[PDB]
Each structure stands twice: as C-alpha cells, then as structure tokens.
Design a protein around this ligand. Structure first.
Ligand code: E6C
Length: 212
C-alpha cells in the first residue's frame, strides 16, 4: 500500500458535515464509508442520508449514540437514500425509508478490521474510507485546530468518525463537527507510536462496507 492515501483527492469524500447536538456521529461515520464505497465502485460521488440511519437503525439509539457496524449492516440489508431525499434534521424521527421510494444505493455487507492492529487499519483505508472510533472527550481533541494530533487522550472511545486517508506519521480523519473545526473539518491523528490502542484508541473498532 502507498505511503499516502487521501480519499478526498480521489473524489470519494463529500463535504464535511456538522452533526449538531445530536449524538449521530455513528451514522455520520457510517455514511462517509458508504459514500466512499459507492464512488470507488460506481464512479459517482453522492451524499447519502445520515438521518435515515439515525431514524431506521434499530440497534442504535438515535440521538443517544449508536454503532457504525449496525448502520453499515442496515445499508447492506436495506440500502440508503440520497441525503437530498432524506435530509438531516438533527433529531431522531420515525423511520421513513419506505415512504421515500426505492433506496438509492446498497452495499453487500460489512467487514471489521482486526482491532488493535495499525497495519490492518491502514490496509483497509488504502482500499476505501473506514469507520473508526476514538476518544474525543478530551479538551485537546475538542480544541484541536490543526497539525498531527498526538493527544493527550486516553483510549476510552466514545466518538465515531471516518478514516479517509493516512500518511507516514498519521491517519486522516473526517469529523462531523462542521467545517469550522480542526483542519477544515478533518483531523490528522498520529500513528506508528507503538500503542496497540492507537492514539485516542483509534484502533478500537473499525468497520467498512463491502460492495461487489
Ligand atoms: C458519538 C458522537 O460524538 O455523536 C455518539 O455519542 C455515539 O454514538 N457514540 C458511540 C461510540 C461507539 C460506537 C464506540 C457510543 O457510545 N455508542 C454506544 C451507544 C450508547 C451511547 C450506549
């Protein structure tokens, strides 16, 4: 795999979003990976619906958190609408998939990256954007304004984000706290520090859609 991977350069990443005060990061994270894999496999870059996963993923808890795995599993089971057809409201509402017409995209499953393994994460990212979790509760992370982020931060993962690239000393993360945070909405987190958890537990739980 290359030394640098940036899915934004390859046209596989939609504008950065802001999840607002709703703990829908899991769905935002899941949606980045879906948009990515559809671009890679179809050539088309579309925005897909976070709101639809928020409303319809019944393993998750809407605005009270949830699981990027289960959201990815839903899109492999049912599919996902375009964001335009099922726009984000920042509140969980009743599930409207059926009422919005045929799904706009569908994947063929969900694979987990072997956890606590930097290489395996990097091999996934080299193939497509990946959903990852990390510890975001620290002020250093909340107050991040640029540069390769090295912490301080523990490994108590509580936030779902999407890894859309990497380089020799970092993994490139797309956050869902709007453009006004980090590096135009992104963070570069240090890698290759020998911590099996990864900086901010970045190697805790990583998933990605499968599309044939
Ligand atoms: C994340 C956010 O920053 O909006 C949101 O709070 C969330 O879904 N967090 C989850 C992280 C795991 C996927 C690692 C989470 O805590 N999920 C568990 C669901 C309940 C909160 C128990």
């Amino acid at each position: 795999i290359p030394e640098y991977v940036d899915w934004r350069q390859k046209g596989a990443v939609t504008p950065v979003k802001n999840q607002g005060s709703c703990g829908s990061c899991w769905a935002f994270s899941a949606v980045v990976t879906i948009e990515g894999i559809i671009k890679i496999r179809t050539g088309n870059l579309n925005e897909y619906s976070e709101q639809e996963l928020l409303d319809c993923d019944r393993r998750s808890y809407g605005c009270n958190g949830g699981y990027p795995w289960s959201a990815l599993q839903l899109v492999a089971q049912y599919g996902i609408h375009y964001r335009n057809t099922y726009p984000y409201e920042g509140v969980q509402r009743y599930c409207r998939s059926r009422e919005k017409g045929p799904y706009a995209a569908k994947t063929d499953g969900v694979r987990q990256v072997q956890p606590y393994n930097e290489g395996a994460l990097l091999y996934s990212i080299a193939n497509q954007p990946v959903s990852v979790v990390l510890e975001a509760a620290g002020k250093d992370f909340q107050l991040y304004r640029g540069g390769i982020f090295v912490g301080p931060c523990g490994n108590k993962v509580d936030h779902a984000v999407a890894a859309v690239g990497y380089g020799p000393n970092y993994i490139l993360i797309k956050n869902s706290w709007g453009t006004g945070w980090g590096e135009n909405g992104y963070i570069r987190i240090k890698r290759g520090t020998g911590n099996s958890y990864g900086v901010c537990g970045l190697y805790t739980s990583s998933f990605y859609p499968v599309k044939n």
